[PDB]
Amino acid sequence: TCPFYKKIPGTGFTVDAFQYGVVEGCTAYFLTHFHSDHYAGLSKHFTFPVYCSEITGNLLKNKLHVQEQYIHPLPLDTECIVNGVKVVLLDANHCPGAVMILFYLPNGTVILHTGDFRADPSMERSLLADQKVHMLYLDTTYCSPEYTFPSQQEVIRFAINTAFEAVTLNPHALVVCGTYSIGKEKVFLAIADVLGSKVGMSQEKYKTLQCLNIPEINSLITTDMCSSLVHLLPMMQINFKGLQSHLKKCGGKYNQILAFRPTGWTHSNKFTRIADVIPQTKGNISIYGIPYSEHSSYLEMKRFVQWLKPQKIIPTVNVGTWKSRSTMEKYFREWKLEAGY
Ligand code: NI
């Protein structure tokens, strides 16, 4: 049944709750972003109102064939009224089209649902600064102090310099980048930009990317693989067997692969600096695991919550084990006592 942490009290609203059938007494289904654990259950057969960003609305229509009459896109940073309740969508700094939702309840409570987010100081200057938030439904994916990672900027710098060096040393090398959902587009687009190539990909992936309102995208992507030296493949195929295979397919146009797997976290982060990352190599194939995250680190998350000072926190991730739940609650209490709220 629909968990309590996907329900907004005092409303008829749910968040990211499409896999439970008809939720009893739900008058509006909000969708924070187009990732499968969150959209699971949507299709052309869905007939209730769906509220979301423009970008997410584009993916619903074109990828899942949801009918237009049930899609309610909302502009960001704009006060809107939904079934008699004031709401605002804010940028979540997650994947394209991902939002946080501010609910202004009739009784005076103010609720922020982060959806999936990467907290950032820039959020401290949105419409959030303008009033107090009573309850926070928090993306706690990396809520433990071992989760550190570099900025997105440092990671992109590492990937660009790596790729540029490799191809300039060997103009017959191919670069490959893995993907399994929207998000992390900067990795492959930044690399193609430094190499003077477009990114080649499957028709289905090109279609997805054309839904995202990314500026000048027609200049960066293509379905012509032959004309491109940066190839996007399913994450599953980013291994020595899958890459040896792909290389056979290019028919002696290329003689080396340099491949990137943007992971969330991996335990090399506790020890290793971004400067110090090395690939796994076999023959003429190298694979780099890079810590490009679109979720908050522990310290980023803490700064955001100590800034916001919510009266009550409801975690939305890692809620299935007692030991996880109990550890997170301990961190929230620390943060509150350290900051004085
Ligand atoms: Ni997500």
Regarding whether 96 and 60 lie in a shared domain, the answer is: yes
Residue with tokens 């006060």: 79
Burial code (b: 16+ CB inside 10 Å, e: under 16) for 34-44 equals: bbeebbeebee
Closest Cα partner for 199 from 99, 327, 80, 208?
A: 208
Residues 138 and 162 both lie in one domain: no
C-alpha 303/C-alpha 91 separation (Å) is: 18
Query: Positive or negative CA dihedral for 80, 85, 90, 94?
Result: negative
- Burial category of 292 from C-beta neighbours within 10 Å (exposed 0-12, middle 13-18, buried 19 and up): buried
Same-domain check for residues 47 and 114: yes
Same domain, 139 and 14: yes
Half-sphere exposure of residue 43, counting CA atoms within 13 Å on the CB side?
A: 5
SS3 label, residue 104: strand
Distance from CA of residue 165 to its chain's centroid?
29
Could you tell me the CA-to-CA distances from 77 to 96, 123, 125, 128, 139 in Å, in that order? Answer: 16, 12, 12, 10, 20
Instruction: Please report the resolution in angstroms.
Output: 1.7
- β-strands 199-200, 221-222 pairing: parallel
Q: How far is the CA of 126 from the centre of ligand 1 (A)?
A: 21
CA of 256 to the centre of ligand 1 (A): 33
CATH no. for residue 139? 3.60.15.10
Q: How far is the CA of 33 from the centre of ligand 1 (A)?
A: 7
Tokens of 44: 């052309």
Span from the CA of 116 to the centroid of ligand 1 (angstroms): 5
Paired tokens of 60: 């619903």
d(CA 24, CA 147) in angstroms, rounded, equals 38
* 115 neighbors 101 (Cβ within 8 angstroms): yes
Contacts 24+ apart (CB under 8 A), 207-212: 207/62, 207/63, 208/59, 208/63, 208/182, 209/185, 211/55, 211/58, 211/59, 211/62, 211/63, 212/55, 212/58, 212/96, 212/97, 212/182, 212/185
> Could you tell me if 337 and 254 lie in one domain?
no
Range of the domain at 198: 148-295
Question: DSSP letters along 12-45, please?
Answer: TEEES--SSSSPTT--EEE-----HHHHTT-STT
Q: How many domains does the chain have?
A: 2
Q: How far is the CA of 9 from the centre of ligand 1 (A)?
A: 23
Q: Which residues are paired to 231 by β-bridges?
A: 176, 200
Terminal alpha carbon distance of the chain: 34
Tell me how far apart the alpha carbons of residues 113 and 174 are, in angstroms, rounded to a whole number.
42
Q: Are 284 and 187 part of one and the same domain?
A: yes
Q: How many angstroms does the Cα of residue 171 sit away from the middle of ligand 1?
A: 36
Residues 202 and 302 in one domain: no
Q: By the 8 A CB rule, do 217 and 185 touch?
A: no
> Which residue carries 């191919």 as its tokens?
174
- Tally helices (H) and strands (E) across the chain: 10, 18
CATH code assigned at 158: 3.40.50.12650
Give 130-176 as a DSSP string.
GS--SEEEE--TT-STT-----HHHHHHHHHHHHHHHHHH-TTEEEE
Structure tokens at 268: 């090399």
Rounded to the nearest angstrom, the distance between the alpha carbon of 34 and the centre of ligand 1 is 7
Strands 110-113 and 99-104: antiparallel
Q: How far apart are CA 195 and CA 130, in angstroms?
A: 44
Cα–Cα distance for residue pair 122/214, rounded to 1 Å: 21
CA of 227 to the centre of ligand 1 (A): 32
Q: Could you give the CA distance from residue 114 to residue 334 in angstroms, rounded to a whole number?
A: 21
**254: CA distance to ligand 1 center in Å?**
35
Q: At what angle do helices 322-339 and 298-308 cross, to 10 degrees?
A: 50
Whether 327 and 197 map to the same domain: the answer is no
Same domain? 190 vs 62: no
Question: In whole angstroms, what separates CA 110 from the centre of its chain?
Answer: 25
Radius of gyration for the chain, computed over Cα atoms and rounded to the nearest angstrom:
22
CB 280 within 8 A of CB 286: yes
**What are the beta bridge partners of residue 233?**
178
Instruction: Verify that 72 and 192 share a domain, yes or no.
Output: no
Do residues 114 and 246 share a domain?
Answer: no
Asked whether residue 89 falls in the same domain as residue 185, the answer is: no
The method recorded for this entry reads X-ray
Q: Give me the residues paired with residue 90 across strands.
A: 100
336 sits in which H/E element: helix 322-339
Distance CA 230, CA 284 (A): 16
For residue 246, the one-letter residue type is: H
